[PDB]
Design an enzyme around this catalytic site. Sequence first.
Site, PDB file in Angstrom:
ATOM      1  N   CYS B  89       0.816  -1.241   0.000  1.00 57.59           N
ATOM      2  CA  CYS B  89       0.000   0.000   0.000  1.00 57.59           C
ATOM      3  C   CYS B  89       0.840   1.277   0.000  1.00 57.59           C
ATOM      4  O   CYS B  89       0.314   2.332  -0.436  1.00 57.59           O
ATOM      5  CB  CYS B  89      -0.915   0.023   1.218  1.00 57.59           C
ATOM      6  SG  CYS B  89      -1.825  -1.536   1.392  1.00 57.59           S
ATOM      7  N   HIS B 341      -8.167   2.126  -4.317  1.00 53.25           N
ATOM      8  CA  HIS B 341      -6.798   1.963  -3.784  1.00 53.25           C
ATOM      9  C   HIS B 341      -6.065   0.978  -4.686  1.00 53.25           C
ATOM     10  O   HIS B 341      -5.929  -0.189  -4.334  1.00 53.25           O
ATOM     11  CB  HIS B 341      -6.869   1.526  -2.314  1.00 53.25           C
ATOM     12  CG  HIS B 341      -5.563   1.193  -1.671  1.00 53.25           C
ATOM     13  ND1 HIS B 341      -4.426   1.912  -1.947  1.00 53.25           N
ATOM     14  CD2 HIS B 341      -5.232   0.287  -0.705  1.00 53.25           C
ATOM     15  CE1 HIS B 341      -3.427   1.451  -1.237  1.00 53.25           C
ATOM     16  NE2 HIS B 341      -3.882   0.443  -0.450  1.00 53.25           N
ATOM     17  N   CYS B 371      -1.608   2.893   6.187  1.00 49.89           N
ATOM     18  CA  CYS B 371      -1.451   1.497   6.634  1.00 49.89           C
ATOM     19  C   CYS B 371      -0.954   0.653   5.458  1.00 49.89           C
ATOM     20  O   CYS B 371      -1.160   1.042   4.270  1.00 49.89           O
ATOM     21  CB  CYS B 371      -2.723   0.942   7.259  1.00 49.89           C
ATOM     22  SG  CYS B 371      -4.085   0.759   6.088  1.00 49.89           S
ATOM     23  N   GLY B 373      -0.569  -3.586   4.238  1.00 49.48           N
ATOM     24  CA  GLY B 373      -0.752  -5.037   4.345  1.00 49.48           C
ATOM     25  C   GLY B 373       0.530  -5.675   4.843  1.00 49.48           C
ATOM     26  O   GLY B 373       1.610  -5.383   4.243  1.00 49.48           O
TER      27      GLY B 373
END
Lengths: 394, 387
Positions: B89, B341, B371, B373
């Site tokens: 991300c 996203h 954040c 993963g």
Amino acid sequence: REVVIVDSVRTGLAKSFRGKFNLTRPDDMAAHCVDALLARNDLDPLLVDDCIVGAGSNEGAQGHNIGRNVAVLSGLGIQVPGMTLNRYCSSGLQAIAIAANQIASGCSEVIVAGGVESITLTLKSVNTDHLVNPLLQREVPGIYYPMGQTAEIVARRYGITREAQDAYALQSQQRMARAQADGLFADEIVPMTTRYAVEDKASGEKQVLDGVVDRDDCNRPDTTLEGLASLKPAFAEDGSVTAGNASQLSDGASMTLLMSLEKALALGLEPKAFFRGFTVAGCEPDEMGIGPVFSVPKLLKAKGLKIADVDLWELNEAFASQCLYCRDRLEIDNEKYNVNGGSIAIGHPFGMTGSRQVGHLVRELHRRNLRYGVVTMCVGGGMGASGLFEAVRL
Amino acid sequence: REVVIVDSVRTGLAKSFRGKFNLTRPDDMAAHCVDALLARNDLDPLLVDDCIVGAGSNEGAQGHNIGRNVAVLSGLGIQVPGMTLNRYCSSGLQAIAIAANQIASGCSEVIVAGGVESITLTLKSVNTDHLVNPLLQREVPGIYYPMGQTAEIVARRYGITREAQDAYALQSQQRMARAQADGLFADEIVPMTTRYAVKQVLDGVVDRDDCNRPDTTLEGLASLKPAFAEDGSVTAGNASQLSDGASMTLLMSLEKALALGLEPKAFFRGFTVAGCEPDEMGIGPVFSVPKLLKAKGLKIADVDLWELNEAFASQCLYCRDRLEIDNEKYNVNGGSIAIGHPFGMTGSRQVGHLVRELHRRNLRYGVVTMCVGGGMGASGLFEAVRL
């Protein structure tokens, strides 16, 4: 802000498919190296800010963000973030440069960085869905040529003879054999316990056996010029490039402990070398082996040095054909060039090589009481990467 | 050595699988962004030192070192090197950080950095060969949890209500709709001509983000079924959408921008990451943000604008309130709940939008954070240039 290498450790390099890493996962191999850095330096794992792992393959056994998973498998645990990168053959050096420049910014103090390749588990495990860009294949077909094909293109285009390539390969085997007999790898290699697969070809008997990788096993100290001259060409029917004057397929991992000088001092750890800069350059993919002739001059200019100021060179021996072209085009002294041999003798696990070269370069600068060394390598896809390191002299 | 963002451009975000990027390759999408950076900045391609592409998937459509291939496809050509990276991300922001720190070292002058994700071409194209480490699945099973499952764990563990999640999702839709109507994405979005599938192939133009729903209501959001658990609070309506797109950012030393007569938009002022429990990966920014502000001598109050990725309303609310950030300064034009996203490009999209909003509101400091993963936070600090 000054940034130092405090330590660098690797696995031995074990022959791919047949050797003692043929069932060992690359994430576990790199985590083993991180664990050795922690034990050797009595380092509080909570002090480590990041874990950067370079790898050629980024899928399957090397998927799911191997750099993060390496952190979590090691004594670093969930507290330490991690990332993966691919600039193929340069990945381990690229990881170290990113670690160094992130520390230099003031936003980190301590990073472990390096690379891994399980050629065994990844070479023939390739997601081919939409892999080829038809437009690239038309515009720059070289992007998809096998590496050995580019090695033959370089030998022919720049007149690097079979004889010169074999003389280079022999030098690599002899220098590596001497360095092994002198124990010059005893501090850089960390042994690893494995399970590995064997099949007797004559009996059909398969077993998983207990093993230890504790040295580089792919080199041949008994290699002769006549032996190399007898080998069949590997990449062209009328070719000059052979298995003997090309890097071997081997598996392994290397990881490097970097920190600010300021932090090394506060922890009472001895700096071995300064990171002094990194460059990359592009070239034609069909002659990717010549990469370093574009990246090295950029690095020396950025840093105010001449060829002559460099005391030692680790230029990856991907193929004798390109390794010689780079040496002679840059007019480097053969007595300062891959002084303990390299990937022709011990193999090129793409991701790890750059971190191996840095760890070795730094130890050899210290052993010879020298100052400046360069790690540089050609990269599949048509690049050169170059890194400048400076020994701490007391 | 001062490093500046000179420009940042992106595709529109098109709905994955059914939208107008459903046959478009991610290398071509990132190359399109590089070509726009060259045209918009009158930039000689031979001045560009590197091309850095972040992507979550690094295989198949995103295999073969996509960063290098983006460079070769673009007007950069074979002379410009490239690399690929994955911090899922955060990858688009991670790429920008690497470029800025490389230029800051004095060994480069000009770098294009960002990311891409074709969710359409990569989500269901995964090499599962030796993918799961059995020891890791035993020691830290959260490493393998679906992202939506981690969003449900954050809602449950930190008491982020269904009602709060929906109200946040509506805010994202309303703020996105107003900014979109007012042309606030027009300069950053580079329209792209496509061929796409409806089994028939049509000519399309991606000229905007198509995933957002300005007609969204609290009553509509409350009617949705949970996406990740039968008794869940996290829905398709309060989670980021699946969209495809690319963003690339032009970085230079301040010296080089001035030699070229280009207007610097913002300084790169630093980048941190932090680890956290994978099963609650959504909270990562609450660990990375304090490390960034401490390293740079700032407090929460010093930050004028936040782009904190809207992966899920559950985690995006938790981070806002745990960090005590003023909602008026937080995702002021909405985000990924409204437009999606595409993992690798998000960080670069956030940077490109943030530097523009800082300039438009005459503000000083902004933070891009997300954040990640696997259990991480990433945080970058940007400072608008006074001219």
